[PDB]
Write a protein that binds this ligand. Sequence first.
Ligand SMILES: Cc1ccc2c(c1)[C@H](CC(C)C)NC(=O)[C@H](CC(C)C)NP(=O)([O-])CCO2
Ligand SMILES: [Ca+2]
Ligand SMILES: [Ca+2]
Ligand SMILES: [Ca+2]
Ligand SMILES: [Ca+2]
Ligand SMILES: [Zn+2]
Length: 316
Amino acid sequence: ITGTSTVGVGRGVLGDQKNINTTYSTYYYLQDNTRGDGIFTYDAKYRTTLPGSLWADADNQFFASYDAPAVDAHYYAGVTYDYYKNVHNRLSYDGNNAAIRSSVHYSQGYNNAFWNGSEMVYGDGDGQTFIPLSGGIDVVAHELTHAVTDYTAGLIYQNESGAINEAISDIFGTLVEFYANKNPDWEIGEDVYTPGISGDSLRSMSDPAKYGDPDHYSKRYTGTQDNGGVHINSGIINKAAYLISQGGTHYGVSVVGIGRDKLGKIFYRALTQYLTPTSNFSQLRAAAVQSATDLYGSTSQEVASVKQAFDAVGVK
Ligand SMILES: Cc1ccc2c(c1)[C@H](CC(C)C)NC(=O)[C@H](CC(C)C)NP(=O)([O-])CCO2
Ligand SMILES: [Ca+2]
Ligand SMILES: [Ca+2]
Ligand SMILES: [Ca+2]
Ligand SMILES: [Ca+2]
Ligand SMILES: [Zn+2]
């Protein structure tokens, strides 16, 4: 759409009010021209055909409940774009300011979100297992990060590489949640998962085993489900990243924390400079070590913590 940039206001899934960037041209659309080639949010109107229709509103106020998921998808995508640009100097997912598109209200009672190779898609949840998925900033950031990974390392979606791909999305979605200082934690999806139950989440990076995911290489899943357990084994890497950041003793191995910022610098460099489509856990370790070496010196504490963390999860 061609029109005038403006700002509207609405309420998100969690009932919070926020301003969002809109474009005016007869209607007000969810099209943000202030970021790269734009952020665009579409209505899939409970169907599965994508992308659906660019979101149009008559008055620039988005307080209807059908509006909520769009508000959040639109706003959280803008925050995530900002994180990459401000923190890593990366312009959108392809590094060349590609337009970011999302569709909401996908299907009926769909309990998931995903990147389909060209855009993000969010289900509204069935209202018991989930509420509209775009209400979780860690969820939106996990989706957009899959785009980042596809454009860079290109980790294939299966076995070890696929688990690395999933951990990357969890890690950066968690860093984005902290960046936005939105009640940050090391849990994934807490904000949209099981509305009736407090305190739970889909996955835990601080203690993956809490939900049954592995937290040590000896406990990895070797079967065929989930493409070889990409959503299961990511637990081992998630645990490693949590230790590098926060520190701790795991399975008797002690790691001194180096903090989030460095965790993000080291993983972003590994991802964009050393990882390849078929990289395995052991290769991820070499990459993280080399990245930290590059950034901080081979005899740095940083390098030391990266090594300890992987040793603690059993990855040699
Ligand atoms: C077993 C499995 C297959 C495909 C999936 C997912 C799991 C998993 C289902 C969630 C846990 C309900 N999806 C994800 O972890 C993320 C969404 C969460 C961050 C809320 N979606 P993607 O990994 O991008 C797509 C595949 O989802
Ligand atoms: Ca309106
Ligand atoms: Ca949180
Ligand atoms: Ca979280
Ligand atoms: Ca819950
Ligand atoms: Zn994922």
